[PDB]
């Protein structure tokens, strides 16, 4: 947050709402929500934007985008699997129970064509929770098979 002194904001001083993104303060919510309209003094009209040059653009892409994987290659694949060796066999088995235990609870509401247990949001609970679980199993299946694959005798 920056600050710009408006001096006398009574009548005919200058037009702040021109440059970029002005006329904020909808209802009582602005930033911390305690400032609302008047903000600090005579509506200093906070606006801040960033920029990147040609050198700063290639620097961030080669350093930090989401996580830093650069500088070394096959270690990030193996070390993630090696530390998880006892965990992967466990996580596949542990999440195997919790996957069906959710399917064995909310899914039983909708069975026949008519209404029995009066399912409402129950059939949609086990669908969204187990949607990523079936995806994570396919991801670790390729990673576990891919690292040991690709040559290395």
């Amino acid at each position: 947050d920056a600050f710009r002194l408006i001096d006398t904001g009574a009548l005919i001083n200058n037009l702040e709402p021109r440059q970029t993104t002005s006329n904020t303060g909808l209802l009582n919510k602005a930033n911390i929500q305690a400032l609302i309209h008047g903000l600090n003094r005579h509506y200093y009209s906070l606006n801040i934007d960033y920029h990147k040059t040609a050198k700063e653009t290639k620097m961030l892409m080669n350093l930090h985008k989401e996580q830093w994987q650069s500088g070394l290659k096959m270690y990030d694949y193996e070390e993630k699997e090696e530390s998880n060796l006892a965990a992967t066999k466990s996580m596949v088995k542990i999440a195997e129970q919790y996957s069906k235990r959710i399917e064995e609870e909310k899914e039983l509401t909708e069975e026949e064509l008519k209404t029995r247990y009066v399912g409402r949001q129950d059939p949609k609970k086990h669908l969204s929770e187990t949607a990523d679980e079936t995806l994570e199993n396919n991801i670790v299946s390729v990673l576990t098979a891919g690292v040991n694959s690709v040559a290395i005798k």
């Binding site: 009582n28 919510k29 911390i32 929500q33 305690a34 609302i36």
Partner: protein
């Protein structure tokens, strides 16, 4: 707008500018520490046996004018203030008060002495009359004084102390409803072990217009009490319900269920879901020893 706003309403207060947003919910019925108010209780006449002779008495005395307020008003009889039922303690006479509020669609309210002593500024004397003022908002229900008698799960069968002071204090306020509101919606039902618990002041019981005697437990009285709770499992008709009640000496209504517990105690050691004639003789022998012990 403020037209829809009133007291005892939980609302949403904004955390930024400190302003009102909307109304969330109301204030719950229980207040302070523990407030027990039961509307339309689960106590019925079919669950209480052996009092049928007494149930018919309290039906035309207590329940009758409360369920039909237009009777005594048209016939010229003043509204009954309160009715007390005296008898042997431990028989569960409180369940009779809960049964009246069930059929009359009233609320069962207990007056506890633990909340009569509290830390407040100026409200120390209010807690005595607070349950009387709040009862106007609880609809024309029936107030029962808690901890004035021993049903077998409680203590202090009775005393001539502050327990009897609060009784005549709330009953004195019944004349105030006729002086100000000119309508009395409050009726208090009480139960004591002896007649000496009451305070002989204000000559004649003007506060309690009906004194009902509670019959002591007998063979025919405990026979219907047992049969209600006696069967959780298979039973036989060869055993006599009066023979089981004859073995019990002075056992109250709460002690009858002790035979029901002992009926399944011997069946649990044998892992049998049926009760034969040999178990009835062993069940009554244990209860007679437990009643005389401690």
């Amino acid at each position: 707008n403020v037209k829809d706003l009133k007291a005892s309403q939980r609302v949403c207060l904004r955390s930024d500018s400190y302003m009102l947003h909307k109304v969330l919910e109301n204030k719950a019925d229980p207040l302070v520490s523990l407030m027990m108010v039961e509307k339309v209780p689960d106590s019925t006449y079919d669950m209480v046996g052996g009092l049928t002779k007494q149930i018919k008495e309290i039906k035309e005395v207590i329940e009758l004018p409360v369920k039909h307020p237009e009777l005594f008003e048209s016939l010229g009889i003043a509204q009954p203030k309160g009715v007390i039922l005296y008898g042997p303690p431990g028989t569960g006479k409180t369940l009779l008060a809960r049964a009246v509020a069930h059929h009359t669609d009233c609320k069962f309210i207990r007056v506890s002495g633990a909340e009569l002593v509290q830390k407040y500024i100026g409200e120390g004397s209010r807690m005595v009359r607070e349950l009387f003022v709040m009862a106007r908002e609880h609809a024309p229900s029936i107030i029962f004084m808690d901890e004035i008698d021993s049903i077998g799960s409680t203590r202090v069968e009775g005393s001539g102390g502050g327990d009897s002071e609060v009784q005549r204090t709330m009953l004195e306020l019944l004349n105030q409803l006729d002086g100000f509101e000119t309508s009395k919606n409050i009726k208090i039902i009480m139960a004591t072990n002896r007649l000496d618990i009451l305070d002989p002041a204000l000559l004649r019981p003007g506060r309690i217009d009906r004194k009902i005697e509670f019959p002591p437990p007998s063979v025919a009285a405990r026979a219907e009490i047992l049969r209600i709770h006696s069967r959780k499992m298979n039973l036989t008709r060869g055993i006599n319900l009066r023979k089981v009640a004859e073995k019990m000496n002075g056992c109250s209504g709460a002690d009858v269920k002790g035979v029901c517990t002992e009926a399944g105690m011997y069946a649990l050691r044998e892992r049998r879901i049926h009760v034969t004639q040999e178990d009835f003789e062993l069940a009554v022998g244990k209860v007679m020893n437990k009643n005389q012990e401690t």
